[PDB]
């Protein structure tokens with residue numbers, strides 16, 4: 001596996017390890033490399049990706065986990081499909097999207113999250129999973145304009161049998177209110193799903209801003225760009241999200257389009273201070289699916 005892959009270009013670095021663009025038998029693939037001391041993170045992400053029935057079009061396609069000794073030290077590898085466009089973050093910074101395009105990005109993301117959160121009952125069943133670090137930089141855009149979720153290293157799996165998790169972290173900017181004020185019940189798996197929804201609402205806000213209507217659109221911005229410094233601390237985020245109770249601003253322009261109106265509504269229903277009041281990934285997917293069948297465009 002890793003023995004025949006040739007690294008060609010450095011393309012990114014997440015919380016742990018670094019991502020490279022490799023070549024396997026002539027085919028481009030993405031390789032995430034971890035150091036020996038990062039074995040726990042490497043192992044956990046390999047573990048999540050190897051979850052029974054995890055594969056889904058809206059989830060990064062996992063190829064394999066492997067070790068590679070260069071003669072001095074050993075590298076811990078995770079190999080996956082390669083997606084030229086890169087992260088949703090990079091995509092939205094470089095391009096603007098049409099109504100159909102925005103819907104495809106949002107729907108695919110919601111479908112990907114719904115799959116993760118959904119428990120598949122059966123002999124070869126799939127446990128429910130919460131991501132815990134959803135954001136535009138952890139989502140990838142495929143050549144067909146659809147998104148797939150990546151970086152599952154912090155994910156948690158639920159055992160409905162006894163209602164327990166198999167095991168604050170994540171990106172401060174996208175942390176849900178209950179996480180920022182640390183009021184979240186770590187023992188309740190449902191709380192992790194709801195926190196994921198809050199984050200996805202922020203992502204939907206990033207996409208919508210880039211929806212170019214009649215040549216009109218807003219420039220790319222991360223959520224809360226107008227309220228907190230770059231790389232904000234938990235305290236800075238808490239004061240804005242928890243105390244002042246602010247959320248990303250919804251442009252007036254969005255009212256001149258039924259598509260943006262539906263999106264805007266979904267956003268609000270994702271940002272409720274109380275996770276139990278937020279929409280579900282499935283409900284969101286259904287809503288966007290119907291909105292999609294309206295305009296008319298590939299799902």
Ligand SMILES: Cc1cccc(C2=C(c3ccc4ncccc4n3)CNN2)n1
Nearest residue numbers: 030031032078079080082083086150151
């Ligand atoms: C499990 C695994 C293997 C290799 C890379 C990744 C990964 C990411 C990834 C995947 C494909 C890419 N294609 C192009 C550019 C960046 C990419 N990043 C992002 N976060 N983790 N994950």
